[PDB]
């Protein structure tokens, strides 16, 4: 069971907190541009995720031109990051 | 009855095993405190860890001279420390102003700011003599909380 | 080739000659009776003769500097500022200020 | 002499030329007293103009000093004029050390050396701290070596070594570190001063 | 240790005003009451790293007041211990600088070797670090028979030990990435701060006190002064390591040239006589009674002396009376000069760069006092 | 080369004690080492030397079990060991009971004392002067 | 003297450019820097555990103060106030009174450990060699009162170290 | 189902007994002696740190905002321990339908552990430094996904069990030569304190050092393998542990040998320099199964 | 004239007035930003007793130096500086405090 496996880890993690809790008795907007680019790149990663699991039944010649195409534009988005990104 | 007396020593053994000191670079004494890291005379991972940190550390070594400018500064560090706290006044300046003393700026005794448990008398406090300060601290922890 | 200092070693001759000729005129505006004009002029005229005789030689730069032309140009650059400040505030020409109290020995 | 003498005088006459050269300008505004002893030169300056003296030695065709590096001050209560701010200057191109002094009492403000020398402002803060001499037209006059809640000026010979506010207790108040307590341990005042005069020629007639 | 009030436009520093002086011990007013022999151990306890390089400036200042030369032997001990401090300081100028960055190994690699260095100090003087060894009468106590063979034994293994750092730190990409291009100041405006040791010496001006002004038997010993080109933190670090490799040359030449003779000044108005001498003869013990308790009886006059510190200078300015107590002096450590540079050094740099500036300038907080 | 390294460790454990002896040099002592021992000191102090190992090292030495009245074997500081600290321990070359003899004057204490610490029978401050006398009587 | 720190362009053309680019493309010098600590790990560490092993010292070393005496009884300290005036910390205090009849040797003798910066000056200024600095490390107290030394007594209790002092002073007469 | 407890209790001991390795192996690098006084070789110290911090050490919170601060260590320890479940090993506990997708997911949610700690403190002084610590982890997770896919596109599906079978004769270090170099650096971004560094505070140590072992094991699956042997589970268990331990030494190697890269120039190593390099190799790894037949 | 200082006689008095307004506005601000300590009203009473001891005025030279000092010890709060309720506190907390009387001081015996 996956449900039994996950819940056992969290319940033991909660118990460790109580041990320390119960027993003893006596600005800058330049960071934002980095965070946004993380999200926009990971969505291109999300489109490029199926590649090892997808390419099994589909035609290779039709895929080859389209598979590289996403990575090329992923570099063009980084090419726009070279024309003055900032001090970061 | 017998289990009560033996379990108390086990908690005291935990502090006898490892003690994390504060790295105060406020002295010439602090260079001798860096000789505790120097391999020839070591308490490093024998008990001492040089990670320090203002909150996680159990021990704080007041290294040498303290001025009236640092008198409110060192006091707020002591409040951030956990309840099992031991203060070592390593150096003659820390004991009661080795030099200066009668001077306007230097605070006499350190105990006027922060209470001291272990005193180390040496100006250039030789690493050999500095090894006593930690070993005596481990020996001084004998009995805590009877009832 | 570049000098060790932040001032860029630029290949420029007669640049030293312009600044040293400029400062001589500034000295001959207000002070005349003062010794400040009478003593500084003969050092500058002695240095100007070395520039005219030696054409772009390192030995000319070695005379009373020995740290290339870039260090010698800095000596001329602040010379105009020092002469203008001496002309503005009277000290060399006039002497009339009060004497100190009689005590010196410790 | 082999071990008794440190160095024979040879550059003393060469350094005496500077004692004439600056004095050849002869300002009552600047020059006053020129003292030269033990391969060193000392000049004291009239309070009215200190900046024009410091612009001199800076650059200059005959002698290039530039560095007006180290800056001291003397506390002495014998004279009618109290303090004596002493400038120690060093040349890199010329290789010589000359001294600039001030004679004024300087409880009243004195002209600053900030426009001529960049690091002079940090030393000027120390003189206002220890001695209490204000510099006119000074940028950022802030306390360095003195305490934030310190009264008076810590160096002046008029008050004791221990001071007035020095001892800092904790005791009764949970957070507030004490100040008003004044008592300290007894500093033994030594009265060791030898009978008979130490050296001839230094004796001044009353 | 340092407060450092920071002004940050987004991430980089605009204004860096170091609100320092948190360790003003108050040596200024305190030395005024003490005699010359009494004031000696204050100078060692001023700077946290230099021991024999300290007192050296103070003793020579008294020696320029008294006009009495130290014995020819004692002067050679002064260089042998003057260069051994140039080892001690330039170890800490590298190790704690690397420890402030985040490097763990180069600190512990050198402190094994540095702990062997205090074996020399213990065998030559009482305490480990600070010693009342360099005095106005030259040198207090002679070198024992065991030490002179140990200096040669140490120096033989030292050349490989210092070169271990170069194959560890200088060759690596990290230091050519981090320390390169931080506060490139070499102009006449850089000269308007006056650092003396490193900085100006490290980049730009070829001036040094070692060659220009002799202290105790100089120019006779062969010296090598490293001068770079760029005023960045990396080239200001390279010269310090180049100082260390070209320092053993002096120590070896100190071992080569040692004339046997006097340790203190033979004239018993400056330095106390021998223990075997004072017990028998009369005048020796009376001078022993008066050189202690009472001071020196100094000639009056204002004198300024500066001997090259590995950090910069010790510009001692002693003003003297007829009395035994020196009335006011100021120790001009480069701590006042280096921290003043942070107004220009921090211009267009990150918070992490500021830590690298303090380390390369080697601002050990004991410097700032006078 | 590989066989000689493993055999050297086996000889060290077999030499000093055996099964119970090796455990005393492992649990109580920080480092285990075998070599020449003097074995002549006040109380239960051994003080060994002559071992090469490293520069500025004079063997295990070992702390005494019950020095005067502490009665401790697990934890012991440098309160133990009689007048030998300036001898074979660090400074001098000659051993205290072998070559260089301690000088007799009948002023030095016969039994060695431990550290004062926070325990009773420790160091104390005391007044010296008889002060200014004042008396009133009927 | 000049030594030069600047390399002045190590790369010129083709062969000299590629290897300077290779160290920045991958690492190489970081792997070379990894090898420095690698061999440093294998070589034996110089470490001294204090409760069993002891560190190196010298015949002349200054620690805790102790006053010596003559071989046939008698306190060696003569009471001068000599060591009092030399003391830069003013840790040592001395008030002297005549001992019973004839002899005049001390009454008050306090050395502060709250003060005292350890010089050996009091060892040097002493003509009779009373205060001789013994090889001492062990001193740890709960209070200042327990730390500062009383009227001789605890200083006279330095008999446990006076056996070492007598050995150390034999390396002190005619210095080293 | 008893095996879950046989993958938490010995794992919590492995994080505890790291304290020996993290300063003795690091010790000999710095020529210092680590643990020695506490145990025979310092084996009693790792368990002694637990008695020190858990039971006796009390709490002093800055503000304690109801649910938070006492919830952040649960997210820290919980996500670190759940990462052990999808691990292939000789045999995995409850094998997922897709392996590596679960591995990347629980690591991307492990960013919250340093996020909620920044919200726990009321002061503005701490949160600016806290967001900077998020930036160290969030940025490298972009590349971590790319370098993963290039290894997968060579051979095998997302399942971690298939990654052992594909490494039968030769390791994956040789075909993925520049990609293996990336996993030495990219893993150190997740609070390892080697290229960049920022009661319940003690619980973060038990979670952060747990991820260090996790990245050591995960690198020994993607790049190491040597042999499988289904008939003999004895040969695989010993050989896997030695390979993982050698990578643990390299993790402590960077911590001692090399200084911090600066936060600004961490975004010059990555993004400016690494992201054009990783995608160019990703472009290369798309063509590889098409140029020569290589499909699972 | 000599020496200048800053102001001449009558002008020096109005410099104190400008200094008084700047310090009067900071005592309500140094309760929320700093600490509660005592009171806002009691803090304003501490201002008036400070200027009473300084009230003499014989020469502008003495007055001008008090302005520079007044723009320093009272400036230790405006630009936000560390004190932690220890520095810049003028009033005695632990004062006895002693009184001036021939019956109160003589009973305790002093000097
Ligand atoms: N605000 C109020 O509550 C209030 C109101 C009106 C009047 N008062 C008065 O003010 C006083 C307040 O004192 P408190 O309650 O603050 O004191 P407390 O906190 O109880 O402290 C007393 C200490 O003395 C020790 N002690 C006392 N009796 C002992 C015994 N028989 N055996 C061993 N140890 C003993 C205890 O040590 P152990 O813990 O180790 O045993 C304890 O640490 C009271 O006496 C009360 O009359 C208080
Ligand atoms: S006791 Fe000595 S070494 Fe320590 S800080 Fe004071 S003067 Fe420096
Ligand atoms: S210790 Fe020596 S110098 Fe001091 S009073 Fe005694 S005999 Fe005299
Ligand atoms: S060692 Fe120095 S400070 Fe200590 S008592 Fe002797 S003279 Fe005084």
From Swiss-Prot, chain A:
Localization, per the record, is: Mitochondrion inner membrane
What the entry lists under InterPro entries is as follows:
NADH_UbQ/plastoQ_OxRdtase_su3, NDAH_ubi_oxred_su3_sf
Keyword Transmembrane helix attached: yes
Pfam families under this entry? Oxidored_q4
- What is the predominant subcellular site recorded for this chain? mitochondrion
Give UniProt keywords alphabetically. Answer: Electron transport, Formylation, Membrane, Mitochondrion, Mitochondrion inner membrane, NAD, Respiratory chain, Translocase, Transmembrane, Transmembrane helix, Transport, Ubiquinone
- Does this UniProt record's set of keywords contain Transmembrane? yes
As its record notes, the protein acts as a catalyst of: a ubiquinone + NADH + 5 H(+)(in) = a ubiquinol + NAD(+) + 4 H(+)(out)
What Enzyme Commission number(s) appear in the record? 7.1.1.2
Record-annotated membrane-spanning stretches? 2-22, 31-51, 60-80
| Enzyme class at the top of the EC tree | translocase
Topologically, how does it sit relative to the membrane? Multi-pass membrane protein
| An example Gene Ontology molecular-function term | NADH dehydrogenase (ubiquinone) activity
* Gene Ontology BP terms: mitochondrial electron transport, NADH to ubiquinone
Could you give the subunit structure recorded for this chain? Core subunit of respiratory chain NADH dehydrogenase (Complex I) which is composed of 45 different subunits. Interacts with TMEM186. Interacts with TMEM242.
What is the role of this chain?
Core subunit of the mitochondrial membrane respiratory chain NADH dehydrogenase (Complex I) which catalyzes electron transfer from NADH through the respiratory chain, using ubiquinone as an electron acceptor. Essential for the catalytic activity of complex I.
Q: What is this protein called?
A: NADH-ubiquinone oxidoreductase chain 3
Origin species: Bos taurus (Bovine)
UniProtKB/Swiss-Prot annotation, chain E:
Co-factor remark = Binds 1 [4Fe-4S] cluster.
| Gene Ontology CC entries for this record | mitochondrial inner membrane; mitochondrion; respiratory chain complex I
Record-listed [4Fe-4S] cluster binding positions: 233, 239, 254
Q: What biological process terms from GO does the record include?
A: cellular response to oxygen levels; gliogenesis; mitochondrial electron transport, NADH to ubiquinone; mitochondrial respiratory chain complex I assembly; neural precursor cell proliferation; neurogenesis
GO MF, one term, reads: metal ion binding
State the reactions this protein catalyses. Answer: a ubiquinone + NADH + 5 H(+)(in) = a ubiquinol + NAD(+) + 4 H(+)(out)
Its keywords, alphabetically, are:
4Fe-4S, Acetylation, Electron transport, Iron, Iron-sulfur, Membrane, Metal-binding, Methylation, Mitochondrion, Mitochondrion inner membrane, NAD, Oxidoreductase, Respiratory chain, Transit peptide, Translocase, Transport, Ubiquinone
Keyword Membrane on entry: yes
Q: Where in the cell is it found?
A: Mitochondrion inner membrane
- The EC class name is translocase
Q: Which cofactor does it need?
A: [4Fe-4S] cluster
**Residues modified as Symmetric dimethylarginine:** 25
Q: Which residues form a coiled coil?
A: none
Record's comment on post-translational modification: Dimethylation at Arg-25 by NDUFAF7 takes place after NDUFS2 assembles into the complex I, leading to stabilize the early intermediate complex.
EC number, UniProt record = 7.1.1.2
The record's comment on protein family reads:
Belongs to the complex I 49 kDa subunit family.
Q: How does it assemble?
A: Core subunit of respiratory chain NADH dehydrogenase (Complex I) which is composed of 45 different subunits. Component of the iron-sulfur (IP) fragment of the enzyme. Interacts with NDUFAF3. Interacts with NDUFAF7. Interacts with CERS2.
Protein name as it appears in the record: NADH dehydrogenase [ubiquinone] iron-sulfur protein 2, mitochondrial
Q: Name the species this protein comes from.
A: Bos taurus
In terms of the whole protein, what range is present?
A: 94 to 463 of 463
UniProtKB/Swiss-Prot annotation, chain F:
Question: Does Electron transport count among this protein's keywords?
Answer: yes
Q: Does the keyword Membrane apply?
A: yes
Query: Which Pfam families does this UniProt record tie to the protein?
Result: NDUFA12 (PF05071)
GO CC terms of this entry: mitochondrial inner membrane; mitochondrion; respiratory chain complex I
- Keyword annotations: Acetylation, Electron transport, Membrane, Mitochondrion, Mitochondrion inner membrane, Respiratory chain, Transport
Q: What is its main location?
A: mitochondrion
Membrane topology according to the record: Peripheral membrane protein
UniProt subcellular location: Mitochondrion inner membrane
Which proteins does it associate with, and in what oligomeric form? Complex I is composed of 45 different subunits.
The record's family statement is:
Belongs to the complex I NDUFA12 subunit family.
Q: What does this protein do?
A: Accessory subunit of the mitochondrial membrane respiratory chain NADH dehydrogenase (Complex I), that is believed not to be involved in catalysis. Complex I functions in the transfer of electrons from NADH to the respiratory chain. The immediate electron acceptor for the enzyme is believed to be ubiquinone.
> What name does this protein carry?
NADH dehydrogenase [ubiquinone] 1 alpha subcomplex subunit 12
Q: Which organism is it from?
A: Bos taurus
Curated annotation (Swiss-Prot), chain G:
Main subcellular localisation: mitochondrion
GO terms under biological process: mitochondrial electron transport, NADH to ubiquinone; mitochondrial respiratory chain complex I assembly
Known EC number: 7.1.1.2
Ranges for domain 4Fe-4S ferredoxin-type come to: 68-97, 107-136
Q: Which GO terms describe its cellular component?
A: mitochondrial inner membrane; respiratory chain complex I
Which key words tag this protein in UniProt?
A: 4Fe-4S, Electron transport, Iron, Iron-sulfur, Membrane, Metal-binding, Mitochondrion, Mitochondrion inner membrane, NAD, Oxidoreductase, Repeat, Respiratory chain, Transit peptide, Translocase, Transport, Ubiquinone
Q: Does the keyword Transcription apply?
A: no
Task: Give the catalytic activity.
Answer: a ubiquinone + NADH + 5 H(+)(in) = a ubiquinol + NAD(+) + 4 H(+)(out)
Q: Which GO terms describe its molecular function?
A: 4 iron, 4 sulfur cluster binding; metal ion binding; NADH dehydrogenase (ubiquinone) activity
Q: Which residues bind [4Fe-4S] cluster 2?
A: 87, 116, 119, 122
State its location(s). Answer: Mitochondrion inner membrane
Cofactor names:
[4Fe-4S] cluster
Q: What class of enzyme is it?
A: translocase
Function summary: Core subunit of the mitochondrial membrane respiratory chain NADH dehydrogenase (Complex I) which catalyzes electron transfer from NADH through the respiratory chain, using ubiquinone as an electron acceptor. Essential for the catalytic activity and assembly of complex I.
Name the protein family: Belongs to the complex I 23 kDa subunit family.
Name used for this protein in its record: NADH dehydrogenase [ubiquinone] iron-sulfur protein 8, mitochondrial
Organism the protein comes from? Bos taurus
Designated gene of the protein: NDUFS8
From which residue to which, out of the full length, is covered? 37 to 212 of 212
């Amino acid at each position: 069971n996956l449900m039994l496996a996950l819940l056992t880890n969290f319940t033991l993690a909660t118990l460790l907190v109580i041990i320390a809790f119960w027993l003893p008795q006596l600005f800058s907007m330049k960071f934002f541009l980095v965070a946004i680019t993380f999200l926009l790149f990971d969505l291109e990663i999300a489109l490029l995720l199926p590649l090892p699991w997808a390419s099994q039944t589909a035609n290779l010649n039709t895929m080859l031109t389209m598979a590289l195409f996403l990575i090329i534009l992923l570099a063009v988005s980084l090419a726009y990051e070279w024309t003055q990104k900032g001090l970061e | 009855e017998y289990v009560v007396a033996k379990l108390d020593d086990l908690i005291n053994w935990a502090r006898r095993s490892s003690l994390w000191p504060m790295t105060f670079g406020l002295a010439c004494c602090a260079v001798e405190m860096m000789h505790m890291a120097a391999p020839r005379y070591d308490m490093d991972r024998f008990g001492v860890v040089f990670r320090a940190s203002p909150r996680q550390s159990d021990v704080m070594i007041v290294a040498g001279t303290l001025t009236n400018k640092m008198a409110p500064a060192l006091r707020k560090v002591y409040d951030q420390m956990p309840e099992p706290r031991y203060v070592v006044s390593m150096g003659s300046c820390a004991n009661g102003g080795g030099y200066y003393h009668y001077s306007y700026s230097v605070v006499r005794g350190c105990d006027r700011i922060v209470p001291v448990d272990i005193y180390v008398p040496g100006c250039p406090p030789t690493a050999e003599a500095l090894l006593y300060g930690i070993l005596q601290l481990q020996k001084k922890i004998k009995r805590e909380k009877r009832l | 080739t570049g000098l060790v200092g932040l001032a860029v070693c630029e290949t420029p001759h007669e640049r030293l000659k312009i600044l040293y000729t400029k400062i001589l005129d500034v000295l001959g505006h207000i002070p005349k009776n003062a010794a400040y004009r009478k003593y500084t002029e003969q050092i500058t005229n002695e240095k100007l003769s070395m520039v005219k005789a030696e054409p772009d030689v390192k030995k000319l730069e070695e005379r009373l500097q020995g740290g290339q032309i870039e260090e010698v140009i800095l000596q001329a650059e602040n010379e105009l500022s020092l002469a203008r400040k001496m002309i503005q505030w009277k000290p060399w020409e006039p002497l009339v200020e009060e004497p100190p109290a009689s005590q010196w020995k410790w | 002499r082999p071990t008794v003498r440190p160095r024979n005088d040879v550059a003393h006459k060469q350094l005496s030329a500077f004692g004439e050269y600056v004095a050849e300008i002869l300002p009552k505004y600047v020059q006053q007293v020129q003292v030269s002893c033990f391969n060193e030169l000392e000049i004291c300056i009239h309070p009215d103009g200190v900046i024009p003296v410091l612009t001199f030695l800076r650059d200059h065709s005959n002698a290039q000093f530039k560095s007006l590096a180290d800056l001291t001050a003397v506390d002495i209560p014998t004279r009618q004029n109290r303090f004596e701010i002493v400038y120690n200057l060093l040349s890199l191109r010329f290789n010589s050390r000359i001294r600039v002094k001030t004679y004024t009492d300087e409880l009243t403000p004195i002209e600053s050396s900030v426009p001529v020398y960049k690091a002079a402002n940090w030393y000027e803060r120390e003189i206002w701290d220890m001695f209490g001499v204000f510099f006119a037209n000074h940028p950022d006059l802030r306390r360095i070596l003195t305490d934030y809640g310190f009264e008076g000026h810590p160096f002046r010979k008029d008050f004791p070594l221990s001071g007035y506010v020095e001892l800092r207790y904790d005791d009764e108040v949970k957070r507030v570190v004490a100040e008003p307590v004044e008592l300290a341990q007894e500093f033994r005042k030594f009265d060791l001063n030898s009978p008979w005069e130490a050296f001839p020629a230094y004796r001044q007639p009353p | 240790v340092l407060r450092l009030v920071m002004e940050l436009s987004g991430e980089m520093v605009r204004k860096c005003d170091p609100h320092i002086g948190l360790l003003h011990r108050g040596t200024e007013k305190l030395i005024e009451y003490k005699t010359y022999l009494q004031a000696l151990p204050y100078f060692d306890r001023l700077d946290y790293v230099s021991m024999m390089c300290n007192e050296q400036a103070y003793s020579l200042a008294v020696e320029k007041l008294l006009n009495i030369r130290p014995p020819p032997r004692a002067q050679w001990i002064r260089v042998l211990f003057g260069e051994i401090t140039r080892l001690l300081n330039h170890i800490m100028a590298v190790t704690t600088h690397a420890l402030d960055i985040g490097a763990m190994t180069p600190f512990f690699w050198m402190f094994e070797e540095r702990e062997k260095m205090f074996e020399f100090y213990e065998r030559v003087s009482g305490a480990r670090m600070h010693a009342a060894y360099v005095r106005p009468g030259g040198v207090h106590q002679d070198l024992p028979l065991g030490l002179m063979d140990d200096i040669y034994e140490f120096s033989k293994n030292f050349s490989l030990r210092i070169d271990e750092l170069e194959e560890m730190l200088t060759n690596n990409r990290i230091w050519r990435n981090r320390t390169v291009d931080i506060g490139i100041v070499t102009a006449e405006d850089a000269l308007n701060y006056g650092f003396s040791g490193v900085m100006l010496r490290g980049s730009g001006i070829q001036w040094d006190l070692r060659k220009t002004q002799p202290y105790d038997v100089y120019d006779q010993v062969e010296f090598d002064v490293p001068i770079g080109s760029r005023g960045d933190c990396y080239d200001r670090y390279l010269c310090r390591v180049e100082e260390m490799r070209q320092s053993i040359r002096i120590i070896s030449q100190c071992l080569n040239k040692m004339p046997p003779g006097e340790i203190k000044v033979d004239d018993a108005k400056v330095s106390p006589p021998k223990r075997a001498e004072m017990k028998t003869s009369m005048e020796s013990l009376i001078h022993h009674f008066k050189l202690y308790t009472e001071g020196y009886q100094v000639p009056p006059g204002a004198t300024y002396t500066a001997i090259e510190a590995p950090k910069g200078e010790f510009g001692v300015y002693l003003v003297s009376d007829g009395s035994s107590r020196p009335y006011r002096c100021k120790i001009k450590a480069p701590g006042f000069a280096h921290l003043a540079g942070l107004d220009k050094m921090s211009k267009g740099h990150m918070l992490a760069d500021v830590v690298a500036i303090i380390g390369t300038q080697d601002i050990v907080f004991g410097e700032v006092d006078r | 080369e590989l066989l000689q390294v493993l055999k050297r460790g086996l000889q060290q454990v077999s030499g000093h004690g055996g099964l119970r002896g090796y455990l005393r040099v492992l649990f109580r002592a920080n480092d285990v080492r075998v070599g020449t021992l003097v074995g002549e000191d006040k109380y239960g102090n051994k003080y060994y030397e002559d071992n090469k190992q490293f520069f500025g090292r004079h063997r295990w030495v070992i702390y005494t079990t019950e020095m005067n009245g502490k009665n401790t074997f697990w934890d012991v500081d440098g309160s133990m060991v009689p007048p030998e600290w300036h001898r074979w321990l660090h400074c001098m070359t000659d051993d205290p009971p072998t070559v260089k003899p301690p000088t007799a004057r009948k002023f030095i204490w016969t039994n060695h004392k431990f550290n004062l610490s926070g325990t009773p029978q420790q160091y104390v401050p005391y007044s010296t002067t008889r002060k200014k006398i004042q008396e009133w009587v009927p | 003297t000049y030594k030069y720190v600047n390399l002045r362009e190590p790369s010129m053309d083709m062969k000299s450019v590629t290897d300077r680019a290779a160290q920045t493309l991958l690492w190489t010098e970081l792997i070379r820097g990894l090898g420095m600590t690698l061999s440093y790990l294998f070589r034996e560490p110089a470490t001294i555990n204090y409760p069993f092993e002891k560190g190196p010292l010298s015949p002349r070393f200054r620690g805790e103060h102790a006053l010596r005496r003559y071989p046939s009884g008698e306190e060696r300290c003569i009471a001068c106030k000599l060591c009092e005036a030399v003391c830069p910390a003013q840790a040592i205090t001395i008030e002297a009174e005549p001992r019973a009849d004839g002899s005049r040797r001390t009454t008050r003798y306090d050395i502060d450990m709250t003060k005292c910066i350890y010089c050996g000056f009091c060892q040097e200024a002493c003509p009779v060699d009373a205060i001789v600095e013994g090889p001492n490390f062990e001193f740890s107290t709960e209070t200042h009162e327990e730390l500062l030394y009383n009227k001789e007594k605890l200083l006279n209790n330095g008999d446990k170290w006076e056996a070492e002092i007598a050995a150390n002073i034999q390396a002190d007469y005619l210095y080293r | 189902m008893i095996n879950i407890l046989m993958l938490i209790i010995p794992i919590l001991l492995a994080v505890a007994f790291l304290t020996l390795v993290e300063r003795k192996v690091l010790g000999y690098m710095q020529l210092r002696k680590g643990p020695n006084v506490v145990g025979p070789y310092g084996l009693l110290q790792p368990i002694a740190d637990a008695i020190k911090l858990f039971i006796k050490e009390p709490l002093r919170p800055a503000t304690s905002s109801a649910s938070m601060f006492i919830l952040a260590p649960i997210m820290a320890l919980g996500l670190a321990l759940t990462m052990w479940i999808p691990l292939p090993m000789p045999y995995p506990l409850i094998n997922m339908n897709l392996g590596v997708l679960f591995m990347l997911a629980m690591s991307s949610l492990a960013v919250y552990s340093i996020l909620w700690s920044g919200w726990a403190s009321n002061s503005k002084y701490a949160l600016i430094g806290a967001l900077r610590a998020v930036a160290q982890t969030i940025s490298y997770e972009v590349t971590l996904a790319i370098i993963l896919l290039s290894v997968l596109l060579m051979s095998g599906s997302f399942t971690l069990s298939t990654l052992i079978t594909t490494q039968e004769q030769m390791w994956l270090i040789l075909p993925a030569w520049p990609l293996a170099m990336m996993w030495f650096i990219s893993t150190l971004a997740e609070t390892n304190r080697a290229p960049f560094d920022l009661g319940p505070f003690a619980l973060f140590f038990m979670a952060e050092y747990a991820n260090i072992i996790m990245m050591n094991i995960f690198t020994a699956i993607l790049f190491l393998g040597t042999s499988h042997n289904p008939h003999m589970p004895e040969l695989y268990t010993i050989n896997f542990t030695i390979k993982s331990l050698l990578l643990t030494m390299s993790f402590l190697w960077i911590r001692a040998s090399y200084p911090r890269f600066r936060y600004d120039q961490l975004m010059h190593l990555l993004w400016k320099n690494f992201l054009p390099l990783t995608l160019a190799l990703c472009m290369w790894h798309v063509s590889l199964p098409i140029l020569t037949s290589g499909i699972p | 004239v000599k020496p200048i200082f800053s102001r001449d006689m009558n002008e020096a008095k109005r410099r104190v007035r400008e200094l008084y307004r700047a310090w009067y506005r900071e005592v309500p601000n140094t309760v929320h930003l700093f600490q509660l300590d005592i009171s806002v009203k009691q803090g304003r009473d501490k201002v008036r007793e400070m200027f009473k001891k300084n009230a003499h005025i014989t020469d502008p030279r003495v007055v001008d130096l008090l302005v520079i000092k007044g723009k320093m010890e009272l400036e230790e709060t405006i630009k936000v500086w560390k004190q932690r309720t220890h520095v810049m506190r003028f009033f005695h907390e632990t004062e006895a405090p002693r009184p001036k009387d021939f019956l109160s001081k003589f009973y305790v015996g002093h000097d």
